[PDB]
């Protein structure tokens, strides 16, 4: 049974190792690895509760573990049905993340890049670092001040909020810094 | 031995429960709870490796677990000595966090609020949401457009970077949005 303990040790060790390089340098491969890695936390939690409930000798702790496993499974299925409700409308793979059900669509370089967004703030920042665009902690790619998006969107079940570009601030040679004020909330 | 399994189940359940309320509404109490909660991940990882190594029957897996426990302990002590090197200069409690060793000092309402900062970007955003100031995901407090800081600092072992306020953008009634361009890097 120590194999599962060594597996959780490997998981914890690599997750700790994730907190020295990937937190600063944001790569799409590393981000999606971290995302699917957080998505697998729910089944391993359920597995821990299951292996706690299999060896039931007394009924108090076993009943507590069974009730909590039922609750966490119910809320996991609630999250699954929420992600299904989102994906039935926005039709985006990033709607199946365990982080949030709030989507950010940015039309950069023609392709619509979709990223998870924390809370859909009324004003959304856009920061240019050495010609690289980042919005809400997501490095969308290499976009200098000339090709900045004009209008982006925030997608949600029965909600689409349009965000219009504000003023652009050219400073420190090539770095730029701009705001997205909320325009309107619709569902056509 | 199932008590430790139920403890890790409680930890995972409450950490999953943390991903529905505290991620959107940022409270200082909830943030510091999450911070000390991430700080206790290192000893529980070491404990998992220790309980994997105590029941050594074969030598291959036991040796692998012992070597990995030694490596994770060595890097944990490296992190401890890094935090000590930081705290010997900046003298701030927030230097003892497992997230980052990059400090952000903001002079808001007279008191110098210090927060962890991800990577010390050359341009730092400041967003006003309903009269509340947030910088790099940290809700520093209630600060409208009038009392915005003039100059903030980023603290680091043998580094202090001064950040000067840029242009201020008043939009949507009371919301504001401003930039901190890097001024100079010193250590006096």
Author numbering:
A (entry chain B), B (entry chain A): 17 to 204
Paper text:
SARS-CoV-2 encodes four structural proteins incorporated into virions, spike (S), envelope (E), nucleocapsid (N), and membrane (M). M plays an essential role in viral assembly by organizing other structural proteins through physical interactions and directing them to sites of viral budding. As the most abundant protein in the viral envelope and a target of patient antibodies, M is a compelling target for vaccines and therapeutics. M forms a 50 kDa homodimer that is structurally related to the SARS-CoV-2 ORF3a viroporin, suggesting a shared ancestral origin.
We reconstituted homodimeric SARS-CoV-2 M in nanodiscs made from the scaffold protein MSP1E3D1 and lipids (DOPE:POPC:POPS in a 2:1:1 ratio) and determined its structure by cryo-EM. The majority of M (189 of 222 amino acids per subunit) was de novo modeled in the cryo-EM map. Each subunit contains an extracellular or lumenal N-terminus, three transmembrane helices (amino acids 17–36, 43–71, and 79–105) connected by short linkers, and a β-strand rich C-terminal cytosolic domain. The two subunits assemble along their long axis, with TM1 from one protomer forming extensive interactions with the TM2-TM3 unit of the second protomer. The inner sheets from each protomer interact through a large (~690 Å2 buried surface area per chain) and complementary interface with residues L138, V139, V143, L145, F193, A195 contributing to a hydrophobic core surrounded by additional polar interactions. The cytosolic domain of M is strikingly electropositive across nearly the entire exposed surface. Taken together, these data suggest that M adopts a stable structure with minimal dynamic rearrangements on the microsecond timescale, at physiological temperature, and in the absence of additional binding proteins. Our data suggests that M in a simple lipid mixture predominantly adopts the short form.
